[PDB]
């Protein structure tokens, strides 16, 4: 219930080329996350990294190439850990691997906060259905298990019968899209989900974007806010160490602004930071700078500012 702050590592992925994403929490932990947050006068509670062990064959090969049942089922264990953390009065930060963890953290939140809304910052809409993308895409496919209007087009995969769609199409706003499949594009249109693509930001501005965003979410009533920030939303020059880097994305300035704005509502309840994959960096510098950016996002969302803060009454 966002009075203090919980840090939860959830190193989940499906393996294959994007398996260094499971190493993201350490990378961010190693960007000095907790210092910052501690030094932002936050009471912190570090809930550690979750067990991610494949079902039902934990032999080598499955670890390198994981099955969907294994993720869906690790999200169940996540929703539970998110749920209890909210229940004890904490704001959830979940350091991620692949954007699929959003399934467990939104499901967890919804549970003790059923009026919540979502800001999905991302180059992708991650809103494919199981029948619209490959076995591999579950990271780019998690929003069709949460939205409540898609269940007519969404089948029962084993590991996923616990998920109970906890969002209507009018509770999620997208910021930063530039890489959207036709299946996704039609869904956005057809079910009247509002979104601000890189085009709408060129036109409107990050200032007017956030203005329009809040009106559509918290405009006629206060709700708890769930920021699912995906790192590939930042232009790749800023965030190179990620699996699907798409060019033309947020500047550093745009991204902090978004965080700055979310904090300034003082309604933020849970935050997801995902797709940080150090195996994909050109150097240690590139891995480090990506995680440094990811520590800034969180810091901002939890009160960091570019112009000062805190307390002083200075001496002579």
């Amino acid at each position, epitope marked *: 219930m966002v009075h203090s702050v919980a840090v939860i590592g959830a190193p989940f992925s499906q*393996g*294959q*080329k994007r*398996k*260094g994403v499971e*190493h993201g929490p350490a990378a961010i932990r190693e960007a000095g996350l907790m210092k910052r947050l501690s030094s932002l006068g936050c009471h912190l509670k570090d809930f550690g990294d979750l067990s991610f062990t494949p079902v039902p064959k934990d*032999d*080598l*090969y499955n*670890n*390198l*190439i994981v099955n969907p049942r294994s993720v869906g089922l690790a999200n169940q264990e996540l929703a539970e850990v998110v749920s209890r953390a909210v229940s004890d009065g904490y704001s959830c930060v979940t350091l991620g691997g692949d954007h699929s963890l959003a399934i467990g953290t939104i499901s967890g939140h919804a549970r003790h906060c059923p009026d919540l809304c979502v800001v999905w910052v991302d180059a992708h809409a991650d809103i494919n259905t199981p029948l619209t993308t490959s076995s591999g895409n579950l990271h780019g496919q998690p929003v069709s298990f949460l939205l409540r209007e898609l269940q007519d087009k969404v089948p029962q995969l084993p590991g996923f019968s616990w998920i109970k769609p906890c969002i209507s199409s009018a509770s999620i706003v997208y910021i930063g899209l530039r890489d959207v499949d036709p299946p996704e594009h039609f869904i956005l249109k057809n079910y009247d989900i509002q979104y601000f693509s890189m085009r709408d930001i060129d036109r409107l501005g990050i200032q007017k974007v956030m203005e329009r965003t809040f009106d559509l979410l918290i405009g006629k009533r206060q709700r708890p806010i769930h920021l699912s920030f995906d790192i590939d939303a930042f232009d790749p020059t800023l965030a190179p160490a990620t699996g699907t880097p798409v060019v033309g994305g947020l500047t550093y300035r745009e991204g902090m602004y978004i965080a700055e704005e979310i904090h300034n509502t003082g309604l933020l309840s849970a935050l997801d930071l995902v797709e940080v994959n*150090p*195996q994909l*960096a050109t*150097s*240690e510098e590139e*891995a480090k700078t990506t995680a440094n950016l990811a520590v800034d996002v969180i810091a901002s969302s939890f009160g960091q500012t570019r112009e000062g803060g805190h307390i002083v009454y200075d001496q002579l």
Partner: antibody, heavy 118, light 109 residues
Framework: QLLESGGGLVRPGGSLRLSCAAS????????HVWVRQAPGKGLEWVSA????????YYADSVKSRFTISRDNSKNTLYLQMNSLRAEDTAVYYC?????????????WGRGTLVTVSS | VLTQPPSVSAAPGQKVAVSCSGS????????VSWYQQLPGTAPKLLIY???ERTSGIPDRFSGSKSGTSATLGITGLQTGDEADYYC???????????FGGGTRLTVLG
């Protein structure tokens, strides 16, 4: 590059300890294995370890005698060999293990000789 | 556990196919890599996911899988090609990576 060492002549019943020094900073994020080649026979995968050393896997051929370890701080993989026999006599090779549609070993070392003769 | 025939022959400029036979639990079910053992050197990766070349390897090399078997085509045979070629994949009955015994290709120039 991968570069193995600390092979040598050891007497049956003997122990020995290999190192593999990797160059990549991405070494710590990636499974590595150990494959040995008995002199002019084929390749036999011996052991494999996870990026963090939470998970080790061993071949029936070498299980419980051999122990795979790594120190990411030193960008080094190790193999501790105990209870060594003639039939362990082989060139031992570190390798990086990665996934895509299936599994392939994309980075390898020069090798190191273990002779186990009475 | 994988069977590939032991030897192969040709003069520079010609072509061969090294065959790899396995089963249900591996090739029938998993992807196959191809590794070139230059004599007196550690092997090098040529092909993963049945036919995916790695950088700088020319298109002379081609891999192919069908049910329970796989095959490495090599055309326009050259000196410095002659070496030991091994197939590799994962067997889901024993839970390991397996290789073929190897094939020695000598180029008679």
């Amino acid at each position: 590059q991968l570069l193995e060492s600390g092979g040598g002549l050891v007497r049956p019943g003997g122990s020995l300890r290999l190192s593999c020094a990797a160059s990549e900073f991405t070494f710590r994020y990636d499974y590595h294995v150990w494959v040995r080649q008995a002199p002019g026979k084929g390749l036999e995968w011996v052991s494999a370890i996870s990026g963090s050393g939470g998970s080790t896997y061993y071949a029936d051929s070498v299980k419980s005698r051999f122990t795979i370890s790594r120190d990411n701080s030193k960008n080094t993989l190790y193999l501790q060999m105990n209870s060594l026999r003639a039939e362990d006599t082989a060139v031992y090779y570190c390798a990086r293990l990665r996934a895509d549609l299936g599994l392939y070993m994309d980075l390898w070392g020069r090798g190191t000789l273990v002779t186990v003769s009475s | 556990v994988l069977t590939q025939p032991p030897s192969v022959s040709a003069a520079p400029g010609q072509k061969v196919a090294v065959s790899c036979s396995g089963s249900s639990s591996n090739i029938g079910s998993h992807y196959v890599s191809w590794y070139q053992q230059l004599p007196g050197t550690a092997p090098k990766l040529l092909i993963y996911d049945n036919s995916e070349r790695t950088s700088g390897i020319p298109d002379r090399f081609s891999g192919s899988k069908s049910g329970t078997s796989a095959t490495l085509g090599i055309t326009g045979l050259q000196t410095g090609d002659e070496a030991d070629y091994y197939c590799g994949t994962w067997d889901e009955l024993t839970s390991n990576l397996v290789f073929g015994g190897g094939t020695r290709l000598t180029v008679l120039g």
